[PDB]
Subunit: 222 residues, 5 copies
């Protein structure tokens, strides 16, 4: 992470040990579940890429998942290099402009990453960009491991609409798909894969029922 | 959040990462349960709107619930604007008076939010007002998801009064209803939806029995 | 809470957010169980009444229990007022002597509460006194909710003495009763409500057996 | 605990509230289990006797166990007094030499305890000595409450050697006995109280098999 | 651990108590499981060998495992001594060069360990080297205690590929074996020890199927 000192200067305040342990506990227990994506974002707020690489290193034991994340980072960096090409030869006496691998923290030191993070002329947020690249790698793992496709998800005959909705949405989240497919699924596949007892009522509600009105009406129905 | 420095000046001390992770853990596990409302209030004490927006952003994945909360904030702000209209043209060289969206932190920076929070002439508590608007959005979600209406709640024949009371009140909390309906329900629906074995005794207690005397008398009855 | 600065001066360092969340978690999960009493004492060490009122406010949703605690505080304060009556008219230029509601923090500010807490002439520990008043309110709730009276508690025929002792004592704790009734119960009701197989041995031990010798002798008996 | 200031001086930094809550949670849940002994040691590192007495006070509700611990402290102090008798009349203008109850923190203030802890001429570690006395009291409670003697511990016919070893050692730990009895038990009672299917193999291993070779060989056997 | 002061000087900031408690909780609950290896690495980041010895001391009660770790440290140190032999007689007025046991922290003080950790001429990372030696001792314990060999691991007939893969990999991790044996096992033993229903499909996928394509294809198959 980064701390400030009198005069407008900046320094490094390393990610703490019990914050890294928590990241490890969220990954080991939830096994790269959907919640692994947000837990990471928060435990990484105010931190720099070097420390994001330490967090991943502590969980490096997982290798199928860390292979997927590593692949993504290399790609995004290449695109950064393509759309932000070397401006030209570098005038000396200054810090080079950030390249794709520096955002990652593999070829670059934390101080250079902090100088960009707090560069008066044009500060580059090296820290937030890398977290996002890593979050696409974590999200793909969730979809890879997701145990149930949404089409299979259904309601126990005596099971209620709320728990079924909870399970149906859990999967829709991990199955990123697209937001429009989600709208069709949330307004139809929920009613279609439901049992008939609460469907009659989900149909009575009307057309384009909202979830607030689908849950209120089916409370106790079955 | 906000920190003070020598001379009476103020600065920003960002909400910490493991406090945001906890907010995420309370939402992911309890699934916008009733306890999500208080956990938030406490994890947000001493914090400013910008940081309240970060907490919500980490849990932004939940979208049906964050749609309900977002709707409420826009409304309250409009009412703030209606009852606290623009005083007139703004004399220059000073900070504008707070508008509805500034309390939210969408159109306004933290420093302006802190200057109001600690404005010597008329300090506006931008931070506490927004938390309350958000808490009405969270509370509506609890009632939307509540799995059981109180009328259905009853006592297992061999189940005791204490657990039944615990389940009956859990729902009464989430079903905000009104405090008077609560008094009628707490003094009648509890006895009526109970089994007859402990009801005989709940009737022996007398009229307007208090809970302290309804629980003491039915300890072991059944 | 209270912090000290160069010169012998004192200031306020508010109870932290994740300490308040823990108090909320202990109350929501244990449901005003016996452990709620000590958790509170510890999370309130070094804190002042204002902050004790914030902790209770976060859990204010619980109302039957907060009605019992509120009743007790008003009483103790009245007794404080009765045995520590207004000394007389107050010489001006100084802080008034503490009244019953100031100990609570309802009519008084934290600074006045801290000035008494650290008054050189006669410092009044406003903070510890209020916590105790609140702990009597919390303890009454535990006894109100206690699910099992000790007389009913018995040993499963195949159940051991240790678990039965654990359950028997759990209730004796919550059923404050008096320490002497406890001695009679701990030396008799334990043996009497036990099964006969381990009682024969609890009788062989001798008269006035101690728990250390009642548990050692019945390890494996049944 | 103890903090240092410019000039070589020392002060008191009280044990924090959420560290005391954890000690309470480890005692309430594990019920003076074996792990209560180490949890305490760690939560007490850098702390002084006064703060060790606060930790015990928060859990003072438990009284059979706190009676056993209290008895031990009085004894050890008496032995300290016997082998470290009053040197003679005390020259004035200095701090007295530590007595048995001062190590406990009952008759002595924290500052005196810190002056000894950091006495240039002959610093007495009042803090660590008392923790050890308390740990003998906690360890006796574990053995008092231990639910199963090792001789009874055996292997389910379909149960594996690893879980049986885990249960057999759990008890051997709490049953301090002596290290030699432990060696005889760990090399024999484990094989003798095992089922015959894995014993044949535990015998094939050879004589004086080590645990590393008893567990590797019986992995899958049964 | 180590802190820095004005002038470029360094000091010691001891490992905190609740960080040591967590290490104890991870060892007591997971019982020297695979996750014990990473939890340790993180809770030890920024710490020095003396503090790594305190963490191990708190869990010293476990003795079969601490015998395995202790054996390894002695060996690695001997190899350090062999490949980094005494340079010769030591010029006086300086700190000796680090020996094998100093890296451990048994014969050496923290200040000397910190002077090497931050030696301008040739800083020796005494802290990280010892953690690695300890991690080989912890990893051997995991393999010793591992309850299931991978060959036995199979898929319940109605069990899915994902959970079976999770269990199969859990063991492959703890059974360090070699990375090549892992590739053969991950591409064959998974399919071979699977049930026939999902194997038909795992065979349809093609030759050298990747896990991402073995999990996607068998989602719902069985
Ligand atoms: O606020 P956090 O980001 O969670 O950091 C906490 C916080 O210390 P700070 O207030 O200085 O940030 C804790 O205090 P509380 O917020 O709970 O009041 C403190 O715990 P203690 O008060 O018990 O000391 C703990 O410090 P530590 O882990 O050394 O005990 C430290 O956690 P981090 O060191 O990981 O930042
Ligand atoms: O013991 P740690 O490894 O340091 O983990 C702690 C532990 O959380 P859990 O009870 O969920 O395991 C703390 O509880 P205690 O050890 O103090 O009893 C809790 O701190 P609080 O009780 O004050 O809430 C905090 O959990 P959280 O941050 O979610 O509130 C969490 O710290 P980490 O999340 O950083 O691991």
């Amino acid at each position: 992470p980064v701390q400030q000192t009198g005069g407008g200067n900046y320094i490094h305040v390393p990610l703490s040990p019990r914050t890294l342990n928590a990241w490890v506990k969220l990954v080991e227990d939830k096994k790269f579940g959907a919640e692994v994506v947000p837990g990471f974002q928060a435990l990484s707020e105010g931190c720099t890429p070097y420390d994001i690489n330490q967090m991943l290193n502590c969980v490096g034991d997982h290798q199928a998942a860390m292979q997927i994340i590593r692949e993504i980072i290399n790609d995004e960096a290449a695109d950064w290099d393509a759309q932000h090409p070397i401006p030209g030869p570098l005038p000396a006496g200054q810090l080079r402009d950030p390249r794709g691998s520096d955002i990652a923290g593999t070829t670059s030191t934390v101080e250079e990453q902090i100088q960009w993070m707090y560069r008066p002329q044009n500060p580059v947020p090296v820290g937030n960009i890398y977290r996002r690249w890593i979050q696409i790698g974590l999200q793909k793992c969730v979809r890879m491991y997701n145990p149930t496709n949404i089409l299979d998800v259904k309601q126990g005959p005596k099971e209620p609409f709320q728990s079924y909705v909870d399970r149906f949405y859990k999967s829709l989240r991990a199955e990123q798909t697209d937001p429009a497919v989600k709208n069709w699924m949330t307004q139809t596949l929920l009613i279609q894969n439901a049992n008939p007892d609460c469907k009659l009522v989900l149909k009575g509600l009307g057309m384009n029922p909202t979830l607030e009105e689908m849950l209120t009406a089916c409370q106790g129905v079955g």
